[PDB]
Amino acid sequence: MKLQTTYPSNNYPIYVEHGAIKYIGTYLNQFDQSFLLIDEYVNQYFANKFDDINVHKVIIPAGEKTKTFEQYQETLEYILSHHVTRNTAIIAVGGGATGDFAGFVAATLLRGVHFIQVPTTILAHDSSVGGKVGINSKQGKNLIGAFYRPTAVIYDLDFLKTLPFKQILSGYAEVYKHALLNGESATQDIEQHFKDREILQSLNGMDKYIAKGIETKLDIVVADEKEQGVRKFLNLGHTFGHAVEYYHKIPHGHAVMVGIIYQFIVANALFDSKHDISHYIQYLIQLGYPLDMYMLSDKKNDKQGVQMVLMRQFGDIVVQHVDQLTLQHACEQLKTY
Ligand SMILES: NC(=O)c1ccc[n+]([C@@H]2O[C@H](COP(=O)([O-])OP(=O)(O)OC[C@H]3O[C@@H](n4cnc5c(N)ncnc54)[C@H](O)[C@@H]3O)[C@@H](O)[C@H]2O)c1
Ligand SMILES: O=C(O)[C@]1(O)C[C@H](CP(=O)(O)O)[C@@H](O)[C@H](O)C1
Ligand SMILES: [Zn+2]
The missing domain is CATH 1.20.1090.10 (Dehydroquinate synthase-like - alpha domain)
Structure with a gap:
């Protein structure tokens, strides 16, 4: 199946299905590079399923532990030290925490690069849609972030089995x-x-x-x-x-x-x-x-x-x-x- 956003324009697709991990390559060869940000635990789990793929893996903290300024600053600095360009892309492979975070990185990197949502959790059927992204402050949940429509959302239901x-x-x-x-x-x-x-x-x-x-x-x-x-x-x-x-x-x-x-x-x-x-x-x-x-x-x-x-x-x-x-x-x- 495949749903989509209906804004005047600037709309992204939402591929939902088992094995939808396949639609990733049909985008990749259109971006300068691609920095795949993946949850530490998720990496352990599916480190192999992504070997098919201009793409450089970035292992980010497990879950809610990645959404901090420190991690935000760190991750940004690391990526910019790769002479990226505006036609680069962030591929969020993980749950809501991972997508929120990476989504914020891609929203601020050079005032905005390309964002690809690869949700791997159930709760992520929500978090991956809507375009809300951000991190946490010593004050609470989601105080810093933004609205950034991803280039696309690729939801492979085979991810849930674990x-x-x-x-x-x-x-x-x-x-x-x-x-x-x-x-x-x-x-x-x-x-x-x-x-x-x-x-x-x-x-x-x-x-x-x-x-x-x-x-x-x-x-x-x-x-x-x-x-x-x-x-x-x-x-x-x-x-x-x-x-x-x-x-x-x-x-x-x-x-x-x-x-x-x-x-x-x-x-x-x-x-x-x-x-x-x-x-x-x-x-x-x-x-x-x-x-x-x-x-x-x-x-x-x-x-x-x-x-x-x-x-x-x-x-x-x-x-x-x-x-x-x-x-x-x-x-x-x-x-x-
Ligand atoms: N619109 C939005 O921006 C939005 C909407 C809803 C919730 N959220 C955010 O989403 C987060 C909560 O969602 P979440 O629970 O999916 O995040 P999460 O990243 O914390 O994932 C939960 C846990 O599952 C692990 N995991 C992820 N993929 C897995 C898989 N396929 N198999 C096994 N374990 C897996 C992770 O390592 C983590 O420990 C919060 O940070 C919340 O604020 C964002
Ligand atoms: O607009 C949204 O997508 C949400 O209201 C966004 C919230 C996050 P917020 O309350 O920090 O905006 C999320 O928890 C909820 O499940 C759906
Ligand atoms: Zn929620």
């Missing part, structure tokens, strides 16, 4: 977030397929729901590309979730699930949406989520206070200030579990 469950759980929180944004329809549907840990962990039919999720975000970002409207909805649970992640050092996805339950509660203490908190808590339990596990600076805020993406009812998403009280009780109400 993800431990922890990452399947982390990444599924995103496949689920998107279904939630598809209203009560695509939701109860996905819950009815991935009903337990076994089906999830087994990745059966995951392909179908990953494409469903890319297809979903692809509409939002084509629409509100600079997050000045509906793209704000994608921050569902990232309010409490970006705070939770950068604080317990738990998988991003895990923290998104928690910000999602949290968001439902805050929606009920405010809109009395009559959300079945106990329903979502058991779904997390049946899936295998680890039930054992700042917001004043998020990117949907203003000089007034907090700003959450609350669901009042399926197909009725809002965004609005929330007193730390409704939050104070929401994070004690969520303690009930």
